[PDB]
Enzyme design. Structure first.
Site, PDB file in Angstrom:
ATOM      1  N   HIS A  90      -0.614  -4.636  -0.670  1.00  0.00           N
ATOM      2  CA  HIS A  90      -0.617  -6.051  -0.309  1.00  0.00           C
ATOM      3  C   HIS A  90      -1.362  -6.885  -1.348  1.00  0.00           C
ATOM      4  O   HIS A  90      -2.428  -6.488  -1.824  1.00  0.00           O
ATOM      5  CB  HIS A  90      -1.232  -6.249   1.079  1.00  0.00           C
ATOM      6  CG  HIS A  90      -0.424  -5.653   2.188  1.00  0.00           C
ATOM      7  ND1 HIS A  90       0.796  -6.162   2.576  1.00  0.00           N
ATOM      8  CD2 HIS A  90      -0.662  -4.592   2.997  1.00  0.00           C
ATOM      9  CE1 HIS A  90       1.277  -5.441   3.572  1.00  0.00           C
ATOM     10  NE2 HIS A  90       0.410  -4.483   3.847  1.00  0.00           N
ATOM     11  N   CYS A 132      -3.460  -4.130  -6.889  1.00  0.00           N
ATOM     12  CA  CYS A 132      -4.017  -5.084  -5.935  1.00  0.00           C
ATOM     13  C   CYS A 132      -5.535  -5.181  -6.076  1.00  0.00           C
ATOM     14  O   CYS A 132      -6.107  -6.271  -6.011  1.00  0.00           O
ATOM     15  CB  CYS A 132      -3.635  -4.685  -4.507  1.00  0.00           C
ATOM     16  SG  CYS A 132      -4.905  -5.004  -3.261  1.00  0.00           S
TER      17      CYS A 132
END
Ligand SMILES: [Zn+2]
Ligand SMILES: [Zn+2]
Ligand SMILES: [Zn+2]
Ligand SMILES: [Zn+2]
Lengths: 227, 219, 220, 220
Positions: A90, A132
Site C-alpha cells: 500500500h 512503500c
C-alpha cells in the site's frame, strides 16, 4: 563455446510458479480506492502471468502463515523454467508497515538463493517489488536474480487508484502486448519509460515515478510460448 | 501524433560526438600499495581507455590524489556520458567510505536538475565496489549503474593483468561493443565473471527508457 | 528442444571468403562513369566485408582459379560470400552471359557439390541487368540478394557507384555486426527504394532458403 | 533517431485485414481422397491460425463465377486494414494443365494487388503464401512477401490425412510464435522444420521485398 546471445532454457515441463504477495499485515485504516485498487493490481497480474504459462499462487500475509511460504520455497522446481514473485504494498503506511515489508522481502528472497533452493540454480528468479536489525535496505543478494522495483530509492510513488497502480498497470499492459515477444529486460525498459513519461497531476508535486530493475542475470530471458 | 509508441526505441546516436568516457581511479586514502595491484589497476585503466576510444569516446581520467568542467561543460553535442569508477580491492574502513561519498556526489552532478545537456541521454556509471545515507544506491532517470559486485558478494583481488570484472567488460566491449545493445552486453559480463569461479556476481541497475546501442559513428 | 531463435554457429576459425566477381565480358566501349564507377563499388564492398572479417578476393572474367575457390576447405570457415557485380546498359550477350555465370557460381556451391560448406550459410549478392532463363536458383542455407527484382528498372552507375551497392555497404558499416543479415537487407530494400531521385521506385529482393538466423558478431 | 534501425509496419489500424485462402481445384481430374480432405485439414487449419491472429478468412475455390468475387476482394478499402494475406493451396500430382493454370492464377492474384493497381494497400505489407506444384516462380512488388512451399529444383510433398508438411508446420509456427516473432523469422523456422522433417530434404523459400519489420501483436 562462448555465445554472445545465450538464453535461459525454456524447455522444462512447466514455466513455474508466479507467486503473488500482497502486504496487508499492519495497515489501518483502508479505503475502497486502495482496496479495489490493490485488487485490480492482483487481478491484472494473475491473468498476465497465466497467459505466459505460469501457475499463479497468491497469499495475503494476514493469514500455517509461514507453512504456505515454505511449500513454495521448499517444493522442487527441477521441472520448472523460472520463479516469479510479485510483492504488492500500500502506498500510504505507518513506519512499521514499511518496515515489515523490508523484512518480508529480505526473508522471501533469501529462501531462493542457490544455497537453499537447489532446484532453481541456473534458473532466473524474478522478484517484482512494490516499494512503500541494521540491514534495512532495498538491496538483497543472489546470482541469476532479477529485482524489479516500482520506485527508485528516493523517488515519489503512485497512490493506488481504483483501476490499480501506475507501475503495475504498465507492467501488465507490456506483458499482455510483448510478454512472449521481447526479452524481459527490454520489456521492463518499456515499463521504465511508460511510467516516467506518465508524469500526471491530487497532491501533485509534480514528481515523476522512476522504476528500476537490478539485474544479476547471466543470460537472455525470453518467455516464448510453451506446450 | 505521427509515429506512436515503439516497442524498440533506441537513444539517438546521431549527435556530433559520442561524448566523454570519464575514468576515475580511487587512490585517495590507500596504504600501503603493491605492484600486483598498482600495475593491475593500471591494466584496468589502460584496457578501458582503449575500448572506449574504439567506441568513439573522448576519454578523460583523473586520480583523486591531485570534476566541475566535466559536469559543468555542455553535452548538447554528445550522445551520452560514461563514468568508470575504479577502486582497490583491499582498503581501510575510511577508503571504502570516501568512495561511497565520491560515487554519491559524482552521480548527483549529472541528474536532470543540474545537467541540462544530458537530459534524455543515457548516463552510464561503471562502479568498482570496495551522513547516514551510506548505500550503493543513487538516483536519476536514464541512468545505468553497473556494479562489479552485488551487495553481499565476494570481489576479486586485482591481479597484474587487471581485475575479473574489468577484463571481462573490455573483452565484451572489444568483441560486441558496437554489435549489441549495452544491457545484453553487460549480461555477458554477468555470466563470464560468475562462471569464472576460480563467486563474484555483477549487477547492473537500469533506469534507462530506451535501447542503448553504440553503433559506429562518423558516417 | 524447439529452437526458436537458433542461429548459425559463428565461432569457427575464419569467417570465410568474400568473392567479388565483376562482369567485364562482352561489354564493348564501356563509359568511364561505369569504369571506376564500378571501382568505387568494388573498393567499397571489399572494405566492408573485410571489416566483418571476410577475406576479399577480387577477380574478373576479362582475364581456372574458379575451381580453386570451391575446392578450398570451409570446415574451419563460417560462411561463403560471393558478390556479383555488373554494369547497367549492356547488349543482350552481356545479359545472357551473366545469367550463365550465376548458374555456375551458384551450382558450384550447392551443398551436394561443395561438402565443406554444408550446413553453412551461402550468401550470393547478385547485381542483375538450357531453357532455364530465370532469376531464381536453388539450395539450402542459400541467400540470393538481388539488386532489383523482376519487372525492374535498374540504376546507372555514376562516380560513386550503384545505389544498391552504395546503401548495402552503408548498412554493413552501421548495422552489419549489430543486426541479423535478413533484417539488414530489409533496410537496404527500404533505403534504395526511398532514394528514388530523378521516376519509379527501385524494388530490390532477397530470396531466403536459410534454416537459421544470421549474425556477424566480431570473431573471437 | 532519423535512421530507422528496427522500423516496423504500423499495426494499429482498425482491422488486421483479409486472409484469402485459394485452393486450386481446376483441371485436377480424379483427385484421390487423401488429397481431397487432405486439403481440408490445411484449409481448416490455416483458416484457424490467421483468424487467431485477427484476420478475416475468406475461402473460395476456382471450381465454382469464381472470377467475379475476385474483383470484390481487391476493390474493398484497406485504408483501415493492416495487411493483405493470400494463401495459395494446390495438390501435388497434377497434369501439366493444372501446373500451367496455377502459374497464371498467381499472376492475376499477385498483379491485382500490386500497389500501383491497388492503392488502398500501398505501403501496407502483402504476404502471398504460395504452394507450388513468363513461366517463372518469382514476381514483383514493394511490401510483398512471397512464401513458397518449396524452391526450384524442388521435390514436393504429397498431401495425406492431415495435409502438407509446409502448411502443417506453417500453422504450427503461427500458434507457437505467430504473435511473438517477426514474420520473416517465423518463416525461417518453417524453413528449418520442414526440411528437417524429412521422413532428400525439402528446401522452402521466401522472397522478401519488405521495407519494414513485421510483427503480429494482438490488435487493440
Ligand atoms: Zn530473443
Ligand atoms: Zn539493436
Ligand atoms: Zn542479429
Ligand atoms: Zn517486434
Amino acid at each position: 563455446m562462448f555465445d554472445p546471445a545465450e538464453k535461459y532454457k525454456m524447455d522444462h515441463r512447466r514455466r513455474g510458479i508466479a507467486l503473488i504477495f500482497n502486504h496487508e499485515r499492519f495497515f489501518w485504516h483502508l479505503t475502497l480506492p486502495e482496496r479495489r485498487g490493490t485488487c485490480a493490481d492482483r487481478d491484472n497480474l494473475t491473468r498476465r502471468f497465466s497467459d505466459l504459462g505460469f501457475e499463479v499462487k497468491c497469499f495475503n500475509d494476514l493469514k500455517e502463515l509461514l507453512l504456505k511460504i515454505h511449500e513454495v520455497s521448499t517444493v522442487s522446481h527441477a521441472d520448472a523454467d523460472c520463479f516469479v514473485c510479485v510483492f504488492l504494498s500500500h502506498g500510504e503506511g505507518n513506519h512499521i508497515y514499511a518496515y515489515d515489508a523490508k523484512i518480508e522481502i529480505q526473508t522471501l528472497t533469501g529462501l531462493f538463493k542457490g544455497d537453499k533452493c537447489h532446484s532453481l540454480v541456473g534458473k532466473p528468479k524474478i522478484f517484482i517489488i512494490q516499494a512503500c536489525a541494521a540491514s534495512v535496505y532495498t538491496l538483497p543478494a543472489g546470482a541469476d536474480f532479477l529485482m524489479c522495483y516500482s520506485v527508485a530509492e528516493g523517488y515519489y510513488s503512485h497512490r493506488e487508484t481504483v483501476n490499480g497502480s501506475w507501475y503495475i498497470q504498465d507492467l501488465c499492459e507490456m506483458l499482455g502486448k510483448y510478454g512472449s515477444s521481447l526479452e524481459f529486460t527490454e520489456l521492463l525498459t518499456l515499463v521504465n519509460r511508460k511510467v516516467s513519461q506518465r508524469r500526471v497531476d491530487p497532491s501533485a508535486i509534480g514528481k515523476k515515478q522512476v522504476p528500476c530493475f537490478a539485474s544479476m542475470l547471466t543470460k537472455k530471458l525470453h518467455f516464448f510460448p510453451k506446450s
